[PDB]
From a paper:
FtsEX, an important component of the divisome, is mainly recognized for its involvement in activating the degradation of sPG through amidases via the periplasmic factor EnvC. FtsEX belongs to the Type VII ABC superfamily, which includes LolCDE and MacB. In contrast to the reported ABC transporters, FtsEX neither transports anything across the membrane nor extracts substances from the membrane but interacts with EnvC to form the sPG hydrolysis machinery to separate the daughter cells during cell division. The activation of AmiA and AmiB by EnvC is controlled by the cell division protein complex FtsEX, which induces conformational changes in EnvC through ATP hydrolysis.
Consequently, the structure of the complete FtsEE163QX-EnvC complex consists of 2 copies of FtsE, 2 copies of FtsX, and a single EnvC. Based on the cryo-EM map of FtsEX-EnvC, we built a model incorporating FtsE, FtsX, and EnvC coiled-coil domain. The core domains, including the transmembrane and nucleotide binding domains, are determined at 2.8 Å, while the periplasmic domains of FtsX are determined at 3.8 to 4.5 Å. Notably, the cryo-EM map of the restraining arm and LytM domain of EnvC are almost invisible. We observed that in the ATP-bound FtsEE163QX-EnvC complex structure, the 2 copies of FtsX appeared to be asymmetric. According to the superimposition of the 2 FtsX from the FtsEX-EnvC complex, the transmembrane helices of the 2 FtsX molecules are almost identical in conformation, but the periplasmic domain of one FtsX, compared to the other, shifts approximately 17.5 Å and rotates 37°. We speculate that the binding of EnvC results in a relatively rigid conformation of the FtsX periplasm domain, while the transmembrane domain of FtsX is almost identical. The 2 X-lobe structures of FtsX tightly bound to the CC domain, which couples the conformational changes between FtsX and EnvC. When our structure ecFtsEE163QX-EnvC(ATP) and the paFtsEX-EnvC(apo), paFtsEX-EnvC(ATP) structures are superimposed using one FtsE as a reference, we observe overall similarity between our ecFtsEE163QX-EnvC(ATP) and the paFtsEX-EnvC(apo) structures, with conformational differences are observed on the EnvC coiled-coil domain. Furthermore, it was found that FtsEE163QX-EnvC (ATP) had a similar effect to FtsEX-EnvC (AMP-PNP). These findings suggest that FtsX-EnvC, like EnvC, only moderately activates AmiB, while ATP-bound FtsEE163QX-EnvC strongly enhances AmiB activity.
Author numbering:
A (entry chain D), D (entry chain C): 63 to 361
B (entry chain E): 80 to 190
C (entry chain A), E (entry chain B): 1 to 218
Write the structure that this text describes.
């Protein structure tokens, strides 16, 4: 109880002893931490925008004259509702008559050109197993050349291009993220280790009386968390100021070239996770660095 | 004299039948085959075409912008509108020629 | 309580600090430790404390063999001992009150008792006016007496002094010796290493002499 | 000049005295520095490297039914080769007939709708003559003033789609680079400052024996340049392990998407510059720290 | 070549260490600076050497006023004197050969001459055996003697000793005093602050006493 207060007071004392050194260390930690946060912001926002844009196409097999109500029921029992399918978009006959009329193509030719031979569109979103283009490949032709509909409006591999872009914005950003977390790992560890090395002269506490290793450790653990935590606190303030600067310019460009898909920040949970992880890393580094010294000051 | 008038009316009716056959050819083949063609020009948005294509294009657009401006998409729609105007004119002319043939046949039949 | 049985110590590098030391010191027995420079006196005191490990022989402190002490039991042995070093080994960034009070903090004592006892121990050596000064703002003799005050604060059972008078004048040297005697009259075993002669000549105590790591007195 | 040799020997000995402290400092400098040198691959390779033209308005006038094989040269003799134009893309008549069939536009109407009246035209490459914005603009209609070409589908292209990359992208990546090129300075300076703070005692001791202001400085400068230089060299040993590893992923997506982007590594002309810059940073940080801690011991 | 004209020194905080000290020391002259603990001895030696600055009065060294010295000319004042401190102020990461040799390196001497002179100065105190050891591997008296060897290695013009015979026994203390006297027979002015009464009682040298920052000794 009282030992906790004494150790915390000692940690604060040796932190405030040299204001410039601790300030420089905190600045280095915060600067090294504001990069992965911005990378995760941009990755998450791009992922959300890409998910909102288009998850899957609606390209299906174009129906021949054999399509009817009963033939549509058969196509549902075969591919449109029994095979890989999420929903049903059977717009056969009049359903794809007004819709074609109000589409980009101008209507009105029905009153003159007898009857409009609108196809029986049978759009369906295949399941995850059939979502893959490689899984589709022959099966997509097999699904198209199964029964009923004659022609097949194949896809343009837009989903494949999106998948390749996601794989890049995966592998590459994953390597960047692991590099950044290693960087902050080593920054915190080295700063704590060097501070403990400077204040190592307290072999006296170990030599003087039975100041057990637990007693010696506590001023250094709490002074390691206070260094990582303050690095994470300054990063959150610094990270969010930066994105506000690169938001008004970024949001305006999105509106011109489409819709103003702005940039969001971090949820409270993300900030808490960052603070907790930084404090934990600092605590671990302080423990390791101090236990390194507690062994070479022994007989 | 009535028989000569009837022979003139029968020649007029034969000419009207020939004009009806020519109208069959022009307008009814328009309808059947060239309106398969016309509703295919409209199917370039309705049946196996377009579907209100607004998807963003990739790098190095092989047409696909000149397409929708004036090529197999844009000029496709432009020539479709031109042919739709031509087919509306053809349908109006088919109605006019049907009225003319009906007037000729009604003159022949009343005579 | 202290006991050496054929204890030897050769520091890693080839320098035999001590050889064949054997002696016995009963509870409440004052004694002096003398010798030339490099004899091996601070090495004897270090072996008693536990800072160094003997290469041979056996060491007994209060009846418990400490020649093969673990690393989780050295703290209690070092708590039972009040030692003043030659370097004064004192924290340079804490007030002298904190330096004198750290043994009480480690022991686990209350606050009012800590203040009372640190004041008494600082007054005994004549430093109570400087209870707030940092150790950099003291002289050599004043830092020496800060070390002495820290040693005598926890009422130890053995007091191991390692030249506690050098850097102190003659009147202060006599005052320090009289303080150690007033501690020893209770039953505290005092072992005082020193090589000044005007102090250990006017008082009749057992004197152990060393000469190149061999006890010529016992 | 034995002073230089003695100072270098002292700096080397001081570095070698703590192999785990020296190595853990070089490690953080190299990892904190490979990010600028690996993110510079992206902006040198791919971007800039594979610069494939742009949405330029090659679109041109639409010729009437008077266009023929001879009229193609006549239009060239007027606008397509005499006015501002570089290349010839006259797809008149059958040229844009099968290509129009195999494009997104389905065929089969040509056999039914008599003959396809594909409005004639000829994409051009406005050479300097009309290349200039105004050189085109006004003279763009003047270009139309050539042979026949009933219409002129000449367009613009690029639009705002050429802003969601010159804007959003043109600032964020520069900001990230600035962040990294501040982090490297900060980490090197902090490491060197802490190294001097560890051994300030010898500074004091040899200052109060006489010495000079410059004698005390040399072992610390040479040990601060050798820390930046040795930490940058390991970043060049790294950042080629990563780039060659990333070459496999980029090569796989080359054929799947189209043109094969070719990856490469850092050149000597930039490797030497990086080593020099890191050496200078370490040197100046050592000078700052030692001069700061040399006016402390001057009562 | 040492003149104090009404010198006074008060440290930051309110401890008047030196008050109204005036005296004079001629070229080639020995003296003993004696006083009680906390009197102002090391402060006086620091004022002479150049470490501290007086609050009033004048200090003349070698005939040139140094009471207000530029930070550029100090290393050429501190180079003419050999100072023996009380902490021994050693470089603990170098060898003792490097510690003794660093003044010659600072002054810019050759290599074989450095080796010869360092060996001579280490023999004069008895530490030639230990020229390859780091100062951690030496006792207290041996580190003291390393400092003393460092001081005399460069043939100074003034010797300023601050309790140079603590941690040394009486034979070694007499040997060190004999070394100082043999340096003073050449014309080196010595000033040696001491807490020893026996050592000064067996010689006839000027004696500056100092009682609470008041010289009244000479
Ligand atoms: N750095 C300092 N700052 C402030 N006061 C100091 C400082 N060093 C010493 N003092 C004080 O100045 C006075 C004289 O100190 P000084 O070091 O001259 O003593 P001394 O004669 O060397 O003592 P001793 O004989 O015990 O070595 C004392 O009151 C002392 O506590
Ligand atoms: N850490 C060490 N490593 C190696 N040898 C050492 C070490 N410490 C001391 N020695 C050597 O052991 C011997 C005894 O040293 P010790 O310090 O025990 O003597 P001392 O009698 O206390 O000396 P002094 O009277 O000068 O204080 C000497 O040869 C000394 O150089």
């Amino acid at each position: 109880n009282e030992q906790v207060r004494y150790a915390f007071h000692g940690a604060l004392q040796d932190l405030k002893s040299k204001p410039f050194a601790t300030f420089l260390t905190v600045m280095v930690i915060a600067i090294s931490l504001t990069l992965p946060s911005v990378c995760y912001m941009v990755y998450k926002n791009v992922n959300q925008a890409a998910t909102q844009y288009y998850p899957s196409p609606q390209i299906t097999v174009y129906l021949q004259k054999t399509l009817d109500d009963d033939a549509a029921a058969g196509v549902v029992a075969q591919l449109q509702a029994e095979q890989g399918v999420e929903k049903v978009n059977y717009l056969s006959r009049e359903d794809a008559l007004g819709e074609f009329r109000n589409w980009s193509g101008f209507g009105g030719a029905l009153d003159m050109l007898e009857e409009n031979p609108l196809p029986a569109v049978a759009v369906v979103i295949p399941k995850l197993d059939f979502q893959g283009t490689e899984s589709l490949n022959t099966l997509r032709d097999r699904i198209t050349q199964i029964n009923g509909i004659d022609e097949v409006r194949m896809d343009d591999s837009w989903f494949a291009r999106l998948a390749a872009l996601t794989g890049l914005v995966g592998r590459v950003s994953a390597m960047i993220g692991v590099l950044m977390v290693a960087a902050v790992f080593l920054v915190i560890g080295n700063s704590v280790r060097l501070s403990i090395f400077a204040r190592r002269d307290s072999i006296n506490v170990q030599k003087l009386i039975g100041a057990t290793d637990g007693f010696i450790l506590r001023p250094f653990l709490y002074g390691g968390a206070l260094l990582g935590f303050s690095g994470a606190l300054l990063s959150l303030i610094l990270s969010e100021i930066l994105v506000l600067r690169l938001s008004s310019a970024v949001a305006e460009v999105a509106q011109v070239f489409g819709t103003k898909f702005d940039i969001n920040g971090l949820s409270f949970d993300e900030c808490l996770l960052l603070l907790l992880v930084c404090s934990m890393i600092g605590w671990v580094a302080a423990w390791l660095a101090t236990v390194q010294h507690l062994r070479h000051f022994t007989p | 004299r009535k028989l000569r008038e009837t022979q003139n009316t029968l020649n007029q009716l034969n000419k009207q039948i020939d004009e009806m056959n020519a109208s069959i050819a022009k307008l009814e083949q328009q309808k059947a085959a060239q309106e398969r063609s016309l509703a295919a020009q409209l199917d370039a948005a309705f049946r196996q075409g377009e579907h209100t294509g607004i998807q963003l294009i990739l790098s190095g657009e092989e047409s696909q912008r000149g397409q929708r401006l004036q090529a197999y998409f844009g000029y496709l729609n432009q020539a479709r509108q031109e042919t739709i105007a031509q087919l509306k004119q053809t349908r109006e002319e088919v109605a006019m020629q049907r009225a003319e043939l009906e007037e000729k046949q009604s003159e022949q039949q009343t005579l | 309580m202290i006991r050496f049985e054929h204890v030897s110590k050769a520091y890693l590098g080839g320098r035999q600090a001590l050889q064949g030391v054997t002696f016995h010191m009963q509870p409440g027995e004052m004694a002096f430790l003398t010798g030339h420079s490099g004899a091996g006196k601070s090495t004897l005191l270090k072996l008693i404390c536990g800072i160094e490990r003997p290469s041979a022989g056996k060491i007994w402190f209060s009846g418990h063999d400490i020649t093969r002490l673990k690393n989780r039991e050295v703290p209690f042995l070092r708590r039972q001992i009040g030692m003043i070093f030659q370097d004064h080994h004192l924290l340079m960034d804490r007030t002298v009150y904190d330096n004198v009070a750290i043994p009480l903090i480690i022991a686990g004592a209350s606050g009012d008792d800590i203040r009372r006892r640190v004041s008494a121990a600082l007054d005994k050596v004549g430093l109570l006016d400087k209870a707030k000064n940092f150790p950099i703002q003291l002289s050599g003799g004043e830092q020496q007496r800060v070390g002495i005050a820290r040693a005598v604060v926890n009422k130890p059972a053995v007091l191991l002094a390692d030249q506690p008078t050098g850097n102190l004048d003659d009147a202060l040297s006599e005052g320090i010796l009289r303080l150690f005697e007033e501690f020893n009259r209770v039953g505290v075993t005092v072992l005082m290493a020193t090589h000044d002669i005007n102090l250990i000549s006017r008082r009749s105590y057992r004197m152990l002499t060393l000469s190149d790591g061999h006890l010529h007195g016992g």
